Amino acid sequence: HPETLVKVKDAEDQLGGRVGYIELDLASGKILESFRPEERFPMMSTFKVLLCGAVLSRVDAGQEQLGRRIHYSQNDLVEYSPVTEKHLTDGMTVGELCSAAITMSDNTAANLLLTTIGGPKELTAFLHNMGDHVTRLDSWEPELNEAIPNDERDTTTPVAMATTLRKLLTGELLTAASRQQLIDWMEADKVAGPLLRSALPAGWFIADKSGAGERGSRGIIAALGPDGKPSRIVVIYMTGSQATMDERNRQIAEIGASLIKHW
Numbered sequence: 001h002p003e004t005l006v007k008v009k010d011a012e013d014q015l016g017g018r019v020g021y022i023e024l025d026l027a028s029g030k031i032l033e034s035f036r037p038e039e040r041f042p043m044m045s046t047f048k049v050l051l052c053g054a055v056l057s058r059v060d061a062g063q064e065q066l067g068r069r070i071h072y073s074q075n076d077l078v079e080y081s082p083v084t085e086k087h088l089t090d091g092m093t094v095g096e097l098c099s100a101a102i103t104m105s106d107n108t109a110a111n112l113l114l115t116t117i118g119g120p121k122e123l124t125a126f127l128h129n130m131g132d133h134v135t136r137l138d139s140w141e142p143e144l145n146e147a148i149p150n151d152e153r154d155t156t157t158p159v160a161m162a163t164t165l166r167k168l169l170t171g172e173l174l175t176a177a178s179r180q181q182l183i184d185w186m187e188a189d190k191v192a193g194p195l196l197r198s199a200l201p202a203g204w205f206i207a208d209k210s211g212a213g214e215r216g217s218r219g220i221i222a223a224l225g226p227d228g229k230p231s232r233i234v235v236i237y238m239t240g241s242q243a244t245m246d247e248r249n250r251q252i253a254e255i256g257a258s259l260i261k262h263w
């Protein structure tokens with residue numbers, strides 16, 4: 001496997017569109033390497049981690065409980081809701097909704113959680129308020145996956161997302177319990193098998209969240225490291241090609257193989 005930045009540029013060569021990449025040291029926050037760090041990419045389902053950050057912040061502020069059961073109708077269901085579609089009678093707790101949104105990419109679960117915080121506008125305010133003046137959520141699922149227009153809506157940058165993820169996971173913004181719950185959900189991710197996880201050696205820790213959108217869009221955010229503990233943050237986004245799902249998966253896995261090999 002080639003050097004990581006070479007592999008990233010190669011992925012872009014093969015896919016077309018743009019590929020963005022950043023690797024951060026978790027302990028220090030220092031940027032180790034990057035490519036297109038400050039360019040915008042659609043967040044796609046990766047936003048669901050930030051959403052649950054906002055939910056946990058409200059729990060920490062005594063405004064929400066993870067045990068609170070939410071009921072909803074079949075009319076609330078949108079595409080890609082593999083968990084929520086199974087609980088129309090019994091409903092789901094806020095904590096269960098976050099697990100579904102993060103670990104299964106459940107869209108209705110995300111929408112229901114957005115409602116609890118006051119919508120995409122309030123998620124953006126939450127981000128602005130913790131120091132992220134770049135990332136913006138403008139739409140609900142499943143419209144936010146349009147990857148254009150309109151036009152910088154529903155976007156982040158690799159460095160914005162990486163910095164914000166780091167603050168959520170290790171900063172004093174959330175309580176220790178809440179930081180732990182957020183990473184626990186990400187560690188339990190069920191649908192990112194073919195991505196960074198495919199290149200992960202035995203004994204390593206990974207907590208991640210993937211996403212997919214229109215116009216060749218794919219992405220992953222991760223905290224990972226050897227010896228069962230995370231030590232670096234990795235964010236990879238891609239958009240603006242006609243690449244099939246399999247090919248986009250392959251390039252991300254190959255970037256992963258590279259950054260592990262050249263750790």
Ligand SMILES: *[B]([O])([O])[C]([C]C1=[C]C(C([O])=O)=[C][C]=[C]1)[N]C(=O)[C]([N])C1=[C][C]=[C][C]=[C]1
Nearest residue numbers: 044045046080105142145191210211212213
């Ligand atoms: B999303 O990325 O905001 C959402 C759900 C989804 C997540 C993942 C993943 O890897 O986490 C993947 C596939 C879908 N995306 C969509 O709702 C989008 N319309 C979509 C749905 C199916 C396949 C591609 C895109």
Ligand SMILES: [Ca+2]
Nearest residue numbers: 009010012013
């Ligand atoms: Ca290029």
